[PDB]
Amino acid sequence: KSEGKPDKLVVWENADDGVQLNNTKKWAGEFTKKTGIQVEVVPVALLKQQEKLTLDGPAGKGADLVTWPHDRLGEAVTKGLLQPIQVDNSVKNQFDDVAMKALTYGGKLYGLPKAIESVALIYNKKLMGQVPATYDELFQYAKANNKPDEQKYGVLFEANNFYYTYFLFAAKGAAVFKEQDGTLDPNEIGLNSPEAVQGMNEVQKWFTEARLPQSLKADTVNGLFKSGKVAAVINGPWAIKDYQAAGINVGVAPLPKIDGKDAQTFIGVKGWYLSAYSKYPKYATELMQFLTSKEALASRFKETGEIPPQKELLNDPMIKNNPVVNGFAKQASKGVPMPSIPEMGVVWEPINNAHTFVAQGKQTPEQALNDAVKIMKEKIQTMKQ
Numbered sequence: 001k002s003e004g005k006p007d008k009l010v011v012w013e014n015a016d017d018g019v020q021l022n023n024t025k026k027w028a029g030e031f032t033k034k035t036g037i038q039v040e041v042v043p044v045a046l047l048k049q050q051e052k053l054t055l056d057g058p059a060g061k062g063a064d065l066v067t068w069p070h071d072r073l074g075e076a077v078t079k080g081l082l083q084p085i086q087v088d089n090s091v092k093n094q095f096d097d098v099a100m101k102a103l104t105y106g107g108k109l110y111g112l113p114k115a116i117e118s119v120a121l122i123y124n125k126k127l128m129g130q131v132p133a134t135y136d137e138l139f140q141y142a143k144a145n146n147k148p149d150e151q152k153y154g155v156l157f158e159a160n161n162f163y164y165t166y167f168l169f170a171a172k173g174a175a176v177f178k179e180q181d182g183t184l185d186p187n188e189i190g191l192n193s194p195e196a197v198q199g200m201n202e203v204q205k206w207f208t209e210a211r212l213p214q215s216l217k218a219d220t221v222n223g224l225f226k227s228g229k230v231a232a233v234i235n236g237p238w239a240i241k242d243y244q245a246a247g248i249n250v251g252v253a254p255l256p257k258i259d260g261k262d263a264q265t266f267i268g269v270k271g272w273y274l275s276a277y278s279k280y281p282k283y284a285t286e287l288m289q290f291l292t293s294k295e296a297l298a299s300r301f302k303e304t305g306e307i308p309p310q311k312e313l314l315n316d317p318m319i320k321n322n323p324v325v326n327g328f329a330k331q332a333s334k335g336v337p338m339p340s341i342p343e344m345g346v347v348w349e350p351i352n353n354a355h356t357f358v359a360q361g362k363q364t365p366e367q368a369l370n371d372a373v374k375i376m377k378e379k380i381q382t383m384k385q
């Protein structure tokens, strides 16, 4: 035996969400009960953990287990904040294959998943019955029913935001970065390809034909849906509690089939990661498994409402027979992980600006995308190491 038994392990969990924190406190508590190892759960906001570990880790005051959305994994790995976990393939196979890809980087695994999210078709049950079967039917519904003058819409979403419009680009075969055997090439950006132009042509139609507000934001979409005058939006699970609090009877379905295939959305995965500064990688990895078991994640789902990308649980009635969860899970099963390489960080601004220029009719799809990609490629070589 080499790794000595730790007196304590430290876990950082979301500070802003009470139920997420208390669920982790529960299962950390059960681990302590089982093993006699103290597990301290410290409240730290998800998007503050990476910065805090950069300071506290080297100081010897860092957590053993940390958590944040997977899209910033690349930054963490390259800067040496995290170390790989060593678990058998049987452990990986407890979880959704695509969710596990999100937590893999440079041919190494960095964590086990807690939650998966994707946009889907969220609809007002008083306004929509059977959801459109195809994208063509959905767009026709928008053209027929969108009335900006009366603040009433058939379909309304953040069509000027690439996170939301990704499915339109993916439908045409467009990629952000060229993928080769798990590795993304930051130098081969696909966002000004002919495929990408076809995607942006669809985006343009939402403003030229479906009459969407040309400077819309998240609050425009959410406010109007909560007003009871919007039949359907394209949005994620993060908006559900707000919609229900407003009195909307909410339905959720996968996005209608587009260009003959399932719609492909981005998925975001929140996992547990292992600090590179942990003195107890083996014991901490045992804790990580304990926190992500079938039992632990069933409990986590019921408390937090966040879909656990755990194979058995995804097939459980707790997911499949829940009217505000099932649709998200179905859509998530057809999605792809948001790129996690550091270079993705500087893609959002230029690509979203390109959406704005197209929406406002200031530039053609081709012109806007060409400009956006030029901007990206300059930003990639700028401050990045």
Ligand SMILES: OC[C@H]1O[C@H](O[C@H]2[C@H](O)[C@@H](O)[C@@H](O)O[C@@H]2CO)[C@H](O)[C@@H](O)[C@@H]1O
Binding pocket: 071, 161, 162, 163, 236, 238, 268, 348, 352
């Ligand atoms: O506007 C681009 C934006 O996209 C993503 O943000 C998502 C977020 O991940 C979801 O949790 C949800 O809130 O919808 C957001 C859409 O704005 C990226 O995570 C973000 O970095 C990027 O700026």
